[PDB]
Amino acid sequence: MNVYFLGGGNMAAAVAGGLVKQGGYRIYIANRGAEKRERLEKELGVETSATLPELHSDDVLILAVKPQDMEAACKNIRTNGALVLSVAAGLSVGTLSRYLGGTRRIVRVMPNTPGKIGLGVSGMYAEAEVSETDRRIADRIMKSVGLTVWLDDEEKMHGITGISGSGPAYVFYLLDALQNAAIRQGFDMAEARALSLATFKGAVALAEQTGEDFEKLQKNVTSKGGTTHEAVEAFRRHRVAEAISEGVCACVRRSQEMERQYQ
Amino acid sequence: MNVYFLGGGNMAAAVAGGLVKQGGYRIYIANRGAEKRERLEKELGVETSATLPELHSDDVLILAVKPQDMEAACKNIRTNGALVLSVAAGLSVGTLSRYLGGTRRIVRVMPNTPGKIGLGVSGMYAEAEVSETDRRIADRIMKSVGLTVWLDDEEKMHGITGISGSGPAYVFYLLDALQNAAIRQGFDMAEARALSLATFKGAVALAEQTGEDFEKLQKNVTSKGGTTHEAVEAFRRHRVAEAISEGVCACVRRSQEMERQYQ
């Protein structure tokens, strides 16, 4: 089964590397500039070319160009009924169907950067008209880089963006926050980084392995009048959790606005 | 080499399980109530008893009782020059030396709960008088559950507590924060938990694998006028990173106060 990529950028390369590891697909990447055609061939050993060859209905096409460049990138593509996946932000299935000349055989994907290392989260959406077998084919492709989360409502793709899409940035910000607090406590940069990292990694691992409710995990290690209680009270006083949700809302609002530019 | 534990509680059991996995030690746990002597034997297969047998200078003793119960727990213990490690909060090496009748062969440890799964962080402190070989022996024991971080100043043990000791609670709080924001965006509880978890785990893994500066990782995936920028601006406006450091300071202040109860 041929999996063509339109665009050979970072997300395309993650998904391509994912598929290579999974085995069983024929990967082919269309990308104009030689620079990164050179890279993918050297590193992944995948086929590349400046343009797409003729497509057929048994192929998969993954659209992976920047959203502002998508309409023109698709201008003369004849999908010939191929299954289309899009990883581009802000372009709805309806818009995509327009750009491609009318086809409805489209699955939208909202992947995130930890997919580069096989720990991704990808939101997935298809209109009702898209068959269960096409969903499963797209689902398997995106599982090659991590978890998939199917959505009932295309609107929720903005929610995905606000949580797992932009979410890695939040975690980096919070890792930096704990690392800076350690510096304030007298740790050198190397120690502060190591402490913040190992703290996050270990706590996240406990939450994963236990499967326990996050608030319960927190409450379980917070004794009244204890040291942890003092810190969590400060967090609460400063409405940290609430600020996080506010940042998420601001992210979602913006995703929504950006999508209006093309629709 | 005998490693005796005074106290068979959660941290003692983590360290004991660590040592079992490492191989090469003889583990023996003194703990009054049978209840958890029963558990450790069934689960870890380690020797237990209500009290300690005679100690010798080639043994290690790990003090793992609650700090308020330590003085009396140590009242009649004759260490006979054994190497002592303490995992108890708020009891300084000087205080420990008093409780034990004068011995200075003491290494203090400030471990954290992810050591239960081999992903711990343990702060370490010994007075200058403690030999490099004794440091290495204590260092190897605590590496059985994770990372060790040696400190020049005993005071920094409060810093450890504010960062990696209480730190897992902060991460649970932040995991819960992202999970609640997902709920607000229309995700059911199962999806919200999975999204928050995978987001944290994947971002933390990227930071680990890249070794890149956290702020740089964040800045690298935050484009001007983009969705992520809107969320991070909100975080900044609400001084989230600063609130985190304030909570850390509050934690450290309290650790310090609590330590004054025994000193």
Side-chain angles (χ1 to χ4, degrees), chain A residues 1-262, chain B residues 1-262:
Chain A
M1 205 195 54
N2 291 317
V3 182
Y4 297 100
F5 290 80
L6 216 221
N10 280 156
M11 279 307 89
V15 174
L19 292 179
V20 174
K21 272 180 57 271
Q22 272 313 317
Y25 299 92
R26 188 283 191 100
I27 305 300
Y28 191 112
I29 303 175
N31 182 271
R32 225 273 72 194
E35 286 188 315
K36 56 168 170 273
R37 273 186 287 130
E38 286 297 286
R39 304 218 315 281
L40 287 151
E41 291 195 12
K42 286 195 263 220
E43 294 179 357
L44 297 186
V46 299
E47 292 174 73
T48 68
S49 168
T51 57
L52 287 164
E54 193 178 39
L55 295 181
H56 308 290
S57 64
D58 52 350
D59 296 328
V60 170
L61 208 210
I62 310 315
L63 306 178
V65 304
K66 29 308 199 297
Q68 56 259 243
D69 311 322
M70 183 78 75
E71 181 177 15
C74 292
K75 200 151 261 115
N76 293 106
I77 287 181
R78 309 149 306 112
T79 65
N80 296 323
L83 173 61
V84 184
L85 278 59
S86 178
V87 303
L91 302 170
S92 80
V93 174
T95 294
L96 288 173
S97 174
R98 270 190 284 120
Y99 292 170
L100 295 169
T103 187
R104 299 297 205 174
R105 197 175 184 199
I106 303 158
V107 175
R108 274 188 64 186
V109 181
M110 188 64 255
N112 72 350
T113 51
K116 298 175 187 200
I117 58 166
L119 290 171
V121 177
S122 310
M124 325 272 287
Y125 175 83
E127 299 277 15
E129 54 221 358
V130 176
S131 68
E132 284 301 312
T133 55
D134 281 350
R135 300 169 55 101
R136 191 162 312 249
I137 287 165
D139 192 74
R140 293 291 313 265
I141 287 172
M142 299 310 310
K143 278 173 155 59
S144 76
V145 302
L147 172 69
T148 57
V149 53
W150 286 84
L151 310 168
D152 288 338
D153 182 323
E154 203 171 8
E155 278 300 295
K156 276 169 186 121
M157 287 288 221
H158 299 302
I160 292 290
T161 289
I163 305 301
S164 51
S166 298
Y170 314 157
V171 183
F172 303 141
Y173 172 92
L174 290 170
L175 277 164
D176 186 59
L178 190 54
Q179 175 180 96
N180 280 146
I183 301 283
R184 170 188 283 181
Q185 291 309 142
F187 297 102
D188 74 14
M189 178 51 78
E191 284 163 340
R193 188 166 156 105
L195 286 164
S196 178
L197 190 71
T199 299
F200 272 76
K201 180 180 179 182
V204 168
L206 278 178
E208 180 179 29
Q209 292 178 206
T210 63
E212 292 173 8
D213 289 338
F214 305 136
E215 209 191 20
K216 279 201 271 199
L217 287 164
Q218 179 208 312
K219 272 174 154 71
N220 287 353
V221 297
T222 305
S223 10
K224 52 82 165 44
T227 62
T228 301
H229 182 251
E230 298 294 311
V232 176
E233 289 286 274
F235 305 164
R236 291 193 195 110
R237 188 152 62 250
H238 292 117
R239 301 174 45 90
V240 169
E242 293 89 333
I244 283 161
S245 194
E246 293 181 76
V248 172
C249 295
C251 174
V252 169
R253 261 199 329 284
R254 159 104 289 229
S255 185
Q256 287 170 345
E257 296 167 345
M258 283 174 90
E259 175 157 332
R260 280 191 308 117
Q261 307 324 306
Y262 311 98
Chain B
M1 205 195 54
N2 291 317
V3 182
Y4 297 100
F5 290 80
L6 216 221
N10 280 156
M11 279 307 89
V15 174
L19 292 179
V20 174
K21 272 180 57 271
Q22 272 313 317
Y25 299 92
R26 188 283 191 100
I27 305 300
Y28 191 112
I29 303 175
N31 182 271
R32 225 273 72 194
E35 286 188 315
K36 56 168 170 273
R37 273 186 287 130
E38 286 297 286
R39 304 218 315 281
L40 287 151
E41 291 195 12
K42 286 195 263 220
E43 294 179 357
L44 297 186
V46 299
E47 292 174 73
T48 68
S49 168
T51 57
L52 287 164
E54 193 178 39
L55 295 181
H56 308 290
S57 64
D58 52 350
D59 296 328
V60 170
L61 208 210
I62 310 315
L63 306 178
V65 304
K66 29 308 199 297
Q68 56 259 243
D69 311 322
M70 183 78 75
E71 181 177 15
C74 292
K75 200 151 261 115
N76 293 106
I77 287 181
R78 309 149 306 112
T79 65
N80 296 323
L83 173 61
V84 184
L85 278 59
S86 178
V87 303
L91 302 170
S92 80
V93 174
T95 294
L96 288 173
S97 174
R98 270 190 284 120
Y99 292 170
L100 295 169
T103 187
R104 299 297 205 174
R105 197 175 184 199
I106 303 158
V107 175
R108 274 188 64 186
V109 181
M110 188 64 255
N112 72 350
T113 51
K116 298 175 187 200
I117 58 166
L119 290 171
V121 177
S122 310
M124 325 272 287
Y125 175 83
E127 299 277 15
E129 54 221 358
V130 176
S131 68
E132 284 301 312
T133 55
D134 281 350
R135 300 169 55 101
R136 191 162 312 249
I137 287 165
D139 192 74
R140 293 291 313 265
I141 287 172
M142 299 310 310
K143 278 173 155 59
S144 76
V145 302
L147 172 69
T148 57
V149 53
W150 286 84
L151 310 168
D152 288 338
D153 182 323
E154 203 171 8
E155 278 300 295
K156 276 169 186 121
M157 287 288 221
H158 299 302
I160 292 290
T161 289
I163 305 301
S164 51
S166 298
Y170 314 157
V171 183
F172 303 141
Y173 172 92
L174 290 170
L175 277 164
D176 186 59
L178 190 54
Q179 175 180 96
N180 280 146
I183 301 283
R184 170 188 283 181
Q185 291 309 142
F187 297 102
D188 74 14
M189 178 51 78
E191 284 163 340
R193 188 166 156 105
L195 286 164
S196 178
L197 190 71
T199 299
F200 272 76
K201 180 180 179 182
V204 168
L206 278 178
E208 180 179 29
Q209 292 178 206
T210 63
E212 292 173 8
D213 289 338
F214 305 136
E215 209 191 20
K216 279 201 271 199
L217 287 164
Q218 179 208 312
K219 272 174 154 71
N220 287 353
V221 297
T222 305
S223 10
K224 52 82 165 44
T227 62
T228 301
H229 182 251
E230 298 294 311
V232 176
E233 289 286 274
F235 305 164
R236 291 193 195 110
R237 188 152 62 250
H238 292 117
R239 301 174 45 90
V240 169
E242 293 89 333
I244 283 161
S245 194
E246 293 181 76
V248 172
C249 295
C251 174
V252 169
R253 261 199 329 284
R254 159 104 289 229
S255 185
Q256 287 170 345
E257 296 167 345
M258 283 174 90
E259 175 157 332
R260 280 191 308 117
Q261 307 324 306
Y262 311 98

